Amino acid sequence: SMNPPPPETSNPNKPKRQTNQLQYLLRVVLKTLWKHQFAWPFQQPVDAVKLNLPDYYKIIKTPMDMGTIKKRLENNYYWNAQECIQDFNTMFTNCYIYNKPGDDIVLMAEALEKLFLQKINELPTEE
Numbered sequence: 001s002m003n004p005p006p007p008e009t010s011n012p013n014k015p016k017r018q019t020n021q022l023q024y025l026l027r028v029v030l031k032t033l034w035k036h037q038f039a040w041p042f043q044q045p046v047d048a049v050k051l052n053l054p055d056y057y058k059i060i061k062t063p064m065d066m067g068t069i070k071k072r073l074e075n076n077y078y079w080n081a082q083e084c085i086q087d088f089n090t091m092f093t094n095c096y097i098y099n100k101p102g103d104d105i106v107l108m109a110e111a112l113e114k115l116f117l118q119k120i121n122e123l124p125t126e127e
């Protein structure tokens, strides 16, 4: 029933870089999604205590949210763009797994994912 610790956003043992693709992911992709009217439920880890969803972290074993992604991008946690893209995809997939089709939260996630894919289709090549 309690919340787990959030995903790691800092780790001195993990290798990291700044790439042009990761810069794009922060400045274009994350910025575009963050200001969407339906972004707010995804801006921090799912608080299963607040929501009284004691099964959330039984069903969802790889939690992810945009607050964590924003911290990882700003803290230069990632090695490459695919690590970040996978985090976004995990966030969407978790929502589709836990919730029913046609739930409001699923409609919200689908709106964000549509924008995400438009922006990722436009991902620049590596410098």
Ligand SMILES: CC(=O)N1c2ccc(-c3ccc(NC(=O)CCCCCCC(=O)NO)cc3)cc2[C@H](NC(=O)OC(C)C)C[C@@H]1C
Pocket (backbone or CB within 6 Å): 040, 041, 042, 043, 044, 046, 047, 051, 053, 056, 094, 095, 098, 099, 104, 105
């Ligand atoms: C992502 C996901 O799958 N879920 C989820 C996750 C988080 C929340 C959620 C998130 C945040 C809060 N409230 C707060 O953090 C307090 C501040 C609210 C926002 C203030 C405005 C702002 O700062 N905007 O940027 C409550 C539920 C609700 C749902 C979903 N519940 C629900 O009623 O979602 C509606 C938004 C449709 C259930 C589900 C488990």
